[PDB]
């Protein structure tokens, strides 16, 4: 892959590479569609519009939007102007977005109407710098200083040229949560999604122009941002977007061509979603779908899930591992080389190192801390020098995963190095769940650990000590949590115990809980 | 009043004042009591303990504690060591405390056991610098590294001298919220509580050594901090503290001598609480109580509440207005000079100005913006230069209130200049409540305004536009907000309307809602 030139604007790059296919559908969703030419026009008009409201090069805007045709316009339009979009999870709380507004110093927000209430709450509680709110598909009357996204785009002529950005200039942020502390602002350059889209989207997945890409992982996920934006635009594929929650029924409807007159040829999702789909009694037969490639990320793919999918569809699930920090997969199975129970082989262009506690090599078959050297690494966590130095050093990026290298060069996930859980491809801190449970007045202590279901898919499991003189229901706690945290941050099962296992120091013996002693 | 010396440590000042009365009870609560000697001992041992864990002079510690004998130990012990306690409301959310931890850079937390769960959540989610959590009266097992307050204090010899602070050095912070944005860190000096305790506590209220002080307003409120700590310690009075919520029954029990063998002689609280007590069927008779002085603040005292109290008890309610920024009252009725319907006269030592639209004087009988010039003003809002400039300008502190000066020199409250409400005498932002309501899926729009109830007390009133195509009941809306807002923020009434009055920009015409137009 040829490196991007020193002067490089990733949005310009994606627009330019599709000037040969102006009338092909770039993006289609439930209610709208954009050809590549329409996408380019709206992108450059939004770029002009953002500059007109005074957002300057390198300033941030918050992109808080459901998947839909407006999303790539917002993302690329900002980048084309040299403005840094901060693309965020749409399922978070007002508290979460309040922090993101403050930390990013976002000068404007591009928000879906359905998310306007939580954004409004975040704006009211925060010390933000937001000058304008741009509402895509408003679901309530606009407030002062808010503008409809279509009107905002429609009111400005296209910017003539992209900002004169450098390949190594920041292009966009994603936020990544760790086990404690605030979410980290992961800074990606213009070059980074070029490298992922070439090394992985084109050269590993072999995406091509006639594909129809459809990702259950939303665009704000590093995974989905490649799957359903940077990858397909790099090759001219058509992308199906879906705003609603990706349930088996919702995915099946898209697979069967229920939207846009298109049948996806390439699907991406999390192992949990594949398992839920394989269990569904209305699972389509392979004769009904156009799938040629099934991609997985976000959590390890149990061999039994992939084997069952392959038996039913005659397609493998191609499991790869990426991270927010590396932007896309650095270890992956190949479309025609799948070893279930492993994450496959280094993606060409990425170097992988496993390190033991001494920082030295580890023997094959022994677990080591996974480090990645690749051209798509984020530059830093914005405003967190300490965590940046711990994660990014000397061209190597520390994943916080443990991995085993097998005899055939494949890599098998061996767990985390920080108790983070990955439920449905989204990071979940067990400590955040625990601290919310203990706020319930009937809870004395609580411990949340990751426990595999029969499938080998890790889910949060709560061990709760009730307070004497109170009785607790499991649903009572789930509700209590949903009233405070994002809606997916709840234990999948809860066991009430008289006492938690602890060391002499009072430290909870989480391994005993995981291992099932109680 | 003689100014404090330039070398001045307020905690040492209060300890020194009471060395003449070592065996008198300083503080007593449901389960404990501290003589002035015991208080000084425990204060100086806590000061040494904080220094021993590395907290340095001028660093902050978060003081998140229910009222109880440990509270003045934590507060004065920090101050004695030259460490800045940040005394905060105990009814806030984990997100509020997470912000306060980061914003204050608190190096330790002193927390009541009952509040450890919300603190734990705040620690887990924030980028804090807390080195140690000290738990007063733990309600659940200590976590590794945490220490019990009693052990923490008991494990360290008393510091031999206080930090050699100056009178105008920061001594402590309180947090105060405005209609939007984060709570503001109000910075008070060592001199400020000297000025309030001398000018108001001693010279206006005439508190004296044989008083027993009891404040419904908690110690973290500027009002309560004077009422139940700086004022009584200044004169050697005994103070009754109560951890639980101040219901009429809870207050009556202590008025009647149910705790510590003492009957309060001085009571302080909000007009809302006085109204609640006057409505209580077991309102004590004046022969049953030892009250000689009843103070109110927080919201305007409706004349009928004062008059009914005076008719029942033969005792007036002495209404004074203070603020977090001014620390205590700057306009007040006097123990023997009460004009109901007014906040009385300037507190000697404080200069009052009413300013019009251009900053000039306003003619008597006309409302103006209230500005205060007095020696207890906070110096700034920490880390917010913009809001500091708008509030503190050249010796004058802008209250955010409007007032009318009467012919007899008294001052009659004329509302706020900023949409904030004082419900139950506590700051409530209508915008917070609105932003909570619109996150309910059946709510399209919401407007919250203050309306005076049957007793003349302002309560929030919600006007809600339901979302078309959704079912929404007043009961389900009450359930929705019950576990999302503190009770004092609950709208006392919700009206479902078809539309809200707006300007063309979408601004809600809240004045029309206050005028009953809907
Ligand atoms: N395939 C696979 N196996 C095992 N663990 C995996 C995995 N994919 C992802 N993880 C875990 O998730 C962490 C990275 O999370 P992000 O939420 O930081 O990155 C996303 O998962 C992405 C997945 N694909 C992309 Cl392309 S980006 C990782 O460290 C693993 O712990
Ligand atoms: N007595 C009285 N009448 C009318 N309004 C009053 C009032 N006291 C207080 N207010 C309002 O409350 C604002 C200040 O609120 P605060 O939480 O910063 O401080 C407290 O209310 C204090 C009250 N007494 C103390 Cl001593 S500290 C004020 O601006 C008024 O709007």
Author numbering:
A (entry chain B), B (entry chain A): 6 to 523
Paper passage:
BadA catalyzes the conversion of benzoate to benzoyl-CoA in the metabolism of aromatic carboxylic acids. Its catalytic mechanism is shown as follows: benzoate firstly docks to the active site, where it orientates to allow the carboxylic group access to adenosine triphosphate (ATP) for the formation of an adenosine monophosphate (AMP) intermediate; coenzyme A (CoA) subsequently comes in to substitute the AMP-activated intermediate resulting in the formation of benzoyl-CoA. The solved structures show that the benzoate binding cavity is rather small and narrow, constituted by several bulky amino acid residues including Y228, G327, S328, T329, H333, and I334.
The capability and capacity of the engineered benzoate-CoA ligase are manifested by crystal structures in complex with a 2-chloro-1,3-thiazole-5-carboxyl-AMP or 2-methlthiazole-5-carboxyl-AMP intermediate. As revealed from the determined complexes, there are considerable hydrophobic contacts between substrates and the polypeptide backbone of the BadA active site. In AMP binding site, Lys427 plays an important role in coordination with the carboxylate group of the ligand by its positive charge and in stabilization with the AMP group during the thioesterification. Several residues in the AMP binding site, including Arg421, Thr329, Ser328, Gly303, Asp406, Asp324, Asp325, with polar contacts with the AMP-linked intermediate together stabilize the intermediate for subsequent thioesterification to proceed. Three protein crystal structures in an apo form and in complex with a 2-methylthiazole-5-carboxyl-AMP or 2-choloro-1,3-thiazole-5-carboxyl-AMP intermediate validated the engineering rationality and synthetic practicality of the modified enzyme. To further explore/expand the substrate promiscuity of P. sylvestris STS, five different thaizole CoA derivatives 4-methylthiazole-5-carboxyl-CoA, 2-methylthiazole-5-carboxyl-CoA, 2-chloro-1,3-thiazole-5-carboxyl-CoA, 2-bromothiazole-4-methyl-5-carboxyl-CoA (2Br4M5C-CoA), 2-bromothiazole-5-methyl-4-carboxyl-CoA (2Br5M4C-CoA) were enzymatically synthesized using the engineered BadA, which were then subjected to biochemical examination.
